[PDB]
Design an enzyme around this catalytic site. Structure first.
Site, PDB file in Angstrom:
ATOM      1  N   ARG A  77      49.136  42.332  47.578  1.00 18.87           N
ATOM      2  CA  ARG A  77      47.975  42.965  46.907  1.00 18.87           C
ATOM      3  C   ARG A  77      46.830  43.224  47.899  1.00 18.87           C
ATOM      4  O   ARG A  77      45.849  43.863  47.502  1.00 18.87           O
ATOM      5  CB  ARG A  77      47.498  42.103  45.739  1.00 18.87           C
ATOM      6  CG  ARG A  77      48.594  41.713  44.757  1.00 18.87           C
ATOM      7  CD  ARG A  77      49.418  42.886  44.267  1.00 18.87           C
ATOM      8  NE  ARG A  77      48.592  43.899  43.637  1.00 18.87           N
ATOM      9  CZ  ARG A  77      48.988  45.136  43.343  1.00 18.87           C
ATOM     10  NH1 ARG A  77      50.216  45.540  43.635  1.00 18.87           N
ATOM     11  NH2 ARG A  77      48.145  45.972  42.756  1.00 18.87           N
TER      12      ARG A  77
ATOM     13  N   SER B 232      44.564  35.990  32.315  1.00 16.78           N
ATOM     14  CA  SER B 232      44.686  37.310  32.978  1.00 16.78           C
ATOM     15  C   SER B 232      44.043  38.389  32.098  1.00 16.78           C
ATOM     16  O   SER B 232      44.231  38.348  30.876  1.00 16.78           O
ATOM     17  CB  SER B 232      46.129  37.615  33.256  1.00 16.78           C
ATOM     18  OG  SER B 232      46.320  38.999  33.489  1.00 16.78           O
TER      19      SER B 232
ATOM     20  N   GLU C  68      30.830  34.581  35.215  1.00 20.29           N
ATOM     21  CA  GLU C  68      31.237  35.818  34.504  1.00 20.29           C
ATOM     22  C   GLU C  68      32.562  35.577  33.776  1.00 20.29           C
ATOM     23  O   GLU C  68      32.724  35.993  32.621  1.00 20.29           O
ATOM     24  CB  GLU C  68      31.381  36.980  35.492  1.00 20.29           C
ATOM     25  CG  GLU C  68      30.093  37.441  36.162  1.00 20.29           C
ATOM     26  CD  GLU C  68      30.295  38.487  37.254  1.00 20.29           C
ATOM     27  OE1 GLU C  68      29.293  38.894  37.884  1.00 20.29           O
ATOM     28  OE2 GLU C  68      31.456  38.886  37.488  1.00 20.29           O
TER      29      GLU C  68
ATOM     30  N   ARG D 245      38.378  37.138  27.114  1.00 18.55           N
ATOM     31  CA  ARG D 245      39.023  36.221  28.075  1.00 18.55           C
ATOM     32  C   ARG D 245      38.944  34.787  27.535  1.00 18.55           C
ATOM     33  O   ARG D 245      37.900  34.391  26.993  1.00 18.55           O
ATOM     34  CB  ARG D 245      38.407  36.337  29.465  1.00 18.55           C
ATOM     35  CG  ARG D 245      39.408  35.916  30.527  1.00 18.55           C
ATOM     36  CD  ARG D 245      38.864  35.714  31.901  1.00 18.55           C
ATOM     37  NE  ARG D 245      38.372  36.879  32.579  1.00 18.55           N
ATOM     38  CZ  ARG D 245      39.046  37.571  33.497  1.00 18.55           C
ATOM     39  NH1 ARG D 245      40.337  37.367  33.730  1.00 18.55           N
ATOM     40  NH2 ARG D 245      38.422  38.547  34.125  1.00 18.55           N
TER      41      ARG D 245
HETATM   42  O1  LIG Z   1      46.509  43.931  37.928  1.00 22.14           O
HETATM   43  P1  LIG Z   1      45.237  44.368  37.354  1.00 22.14           P
HETATM   44  O2  LIG Z   1      44.894  45.752  37.665  1.00 22.14           O
HETATM   45  O3  LIG Z   1      45.085  44.052  35.916  1.00 22.14           O
HETATM   46  O4  LIG Z   1      44.087  43.603  38.164  1.00 22.14           O
HETATM   47  C1  LIG Z   1      44.267  42.471  39.035  1.00 22.14           C
HETATM   48  C2  LIG Z   1      43.641  42.817  40.374  1.00 22.14           C
HETATM   49  O5  LIG Z   1      44.286  43.954  40.982  1.00 22.14           O
HETATM   50  P2  LIG Z   1      45.041  43.793  42.469  1.00 22.14           P
HETATM   51  O6  LIG Z   1      46.008  42.825  42.245  1.00 22.14           O
HETATM   52  O7  LIG Z   1      45.461  45.142  42.458  1.00 22.14           O
HETATM   53  O8  LIG Z   1      44.027  43.449  43.486  1.00 22.14           O
HETATM   54  C3  LIG Z   1      42.167  43.104  40.214  1.00 22.14           C
HETATM   55  O9  LIG Z   1      41.576  43.510  41.474  1.00 22.14           O
HETATM   56  P3  LIG Z   1      41.253  44.980  41.914  1.00 22.14           P
HETATM   57  O10 LIG Z   1      42.152  45.224  43.087  1.00 22.14           O
HETATM   58  O11 LIG Z   1      41.482  45.921  40.879  1.00 22.14           O
HETATM   59  O12 LIG Z   1      39.808  44.946  42.338  1.00 22.14           O
HETATM   60  C4  LIG Z   1      41.566  41.773  39.827  1.00 22.14           C
HETATM   61  O13 LIG Z   1      40.120  41.782  39.959  1.00 22.14           O
HETATM   62  P4  LIG Z   1      39.364  40.759  40.849  1.00 22.14           P
HETATM   63  O14 LIG Z   1      39.862  40.868  42.274  1.00 22.14           O
HETATM   64  O15 LIG Z   1      39.448  39.381  40.361  1.00 22.14           O
HETATM   65  O16 LIG Z   1      37.890  41.360  40.786  1.00 22.14           O
HETATM   66  P5  LIG Z   1      36.597  41.248  39.659  1.00 22.14           P
HETATM   67  O17 LIG Z   1      36.939  42.238  38.779  1.00 22.14           O
HETATM   68  O18 LIG Z   1      36.770  39.902  39.175  1.00 22.14           O
HETATM   69  O19 LIG Z   1      35.539  41.401  40.597  1.00 22.14           O
HETATM   70  C5  LIG Z   1      42.032  41.480  38.423  1.00 22.14           C
HETATM   71  O20 LIG Z   1      41.496  40.213  38.048  1.00 22.14           O
HETATM   72  P6  LIG Z   1      40.434  40.127  36.750  1.00 22.14           P
HETATM   73  O21 LIG Z   1      39.147  39.953  37.270  1.00 22.14           O
HETATM   74  O22 LIG Z   1      41.005  38.937  36.204  1.00 22.14           O
HETATM   75  O23 LIG Z   1      40.567  41.317  35.957  1.00 22.14           O
HETATM   76  C6  LIG Z   1      43.531  41.268  38.476  1.00 22.14           C
HETATM   77  O24 LIG Z   1      44.043  40.970  37.160  1.00 22.14           O
HETATM   78  P7  LIG Z   1      44.564  39.557  36.764  1.00 22.14           P
HETATM   79  O25 LIG Z   1      44.681  38.650  37.886  1.00 22.14           O
HETATM   80  O26 LIG Z   1      45.803  39.792  36.011  1.00 22.14           O
HETATM   81  O27 LIG Z   1      43.498  39.010  35.743  1.00 22.14           O
HETATM   82  F   LIG Z   2      34.418  40.962  38.371  1.00 23.18           F
HETATM   83 MG   LIG Z   3      35.348  39.166  37.873  1.00 25.26          MG
HETATM   84 MG   LIG Z   4      38.390  38.549  38.720  1.00 24.68          MG
HETATM   85 MG   LIG Z   5      33.497  41.183  40.088  1.00 22.92          MG
END
Ligand SMILES: O=P(O)(O)O[C@H]1[C@@H](OP(=O)(O)O)[C@H](OP(=O)(O)O)[C@@H](OP(=O)(O)OP(=O)(O)O)[C@H](OP(=O)(O)O)[C@H]1OP(=O)(O)O
Ligand SMILES: [F-]
Ligand SMILES: [Mg+2]
Ligand SMILES: [Mg+2]
Ligand SMILES: [Mg+2]
Ligand SMILES: [Cl-]
Ligand SMILES: [Cl-]
Length: 134
Positions: A81, A31, A61, A107
């Protein structure tokens, strides 16, 4: 740029990154905000981006792996979500040492037997645990 379905759900893609065609061991990543937790690598589809293309891009990525794209497993909603994820099988053939999310946010990645992946996903990511149910 985040993209959305007509009902306002964020569009995402992810892969189950298997070590081999036996689909016995899968790669999870940490995460971003809670590095002691595991997730299935995945993220937002870009405008006009095919789901299979997004899935492979996000795995590169986040997990620093490439391989042979396999079948669509299914499309999975997170009601709380408000996102909808296309989940593909990827058979990993290339493991790269210094990938975007390792360099940028530290990561981590780790191989799990399927049963252990389901166990560590259950508490915070039960929908991601459900990716493995079939
Ligand atoms: O809770 P938070 O703010 O820390 O972020 C959540 C999630 O938020 P949500 O639950 O509100 O949707 C993010 O989506 P957003 O809504 O902000 O776009 C998501 O990005 P994602 O969809 O994968 O998109 P990309 O960035 O990969 O394109 C991110 O995944 P990470 O990529 O791993 O950071 C998640 O963290 P976690 O799963 O813990 O790792
Ligand atoms: F991303
Ligand atoms: Mg991503
Ligand atoms: Mg992601
Ligand atoms: Mg992305
Ligand atoms: Cl395997
Ligand atoms: Cl989820």
């Amino acid at each position: 740029t985040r993209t959305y379905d007509g009902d306002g759900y964020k569009k995402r893609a992810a892969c189950l990154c298997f070590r081999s065609e036996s689909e016995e061991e899968v790669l999870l990543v940490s995460s971003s905000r809670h590095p002691d937790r595991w997730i299935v690598p995945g993220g937002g589809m870009e405008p006009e981006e095919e789901p299979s293309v997004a899935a492979v891009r996000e795995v590169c990525e986040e997990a620093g792996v490439k391989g042979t794209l396999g079948r669509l497993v299914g499309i999975f909603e997170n009601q709380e979500r408000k996102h909808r994820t296309y989940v593909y099988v990827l058979i990993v053939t290339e493991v790269l040492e210094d990938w975007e999310d390792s360099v940028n946010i530290g990561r981590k990645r780790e191989w799990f037997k399927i049963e252990d992946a389901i166990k560590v996903l259950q508490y915070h990511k039960p929908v991601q645990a459900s990716y493995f149910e079939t």
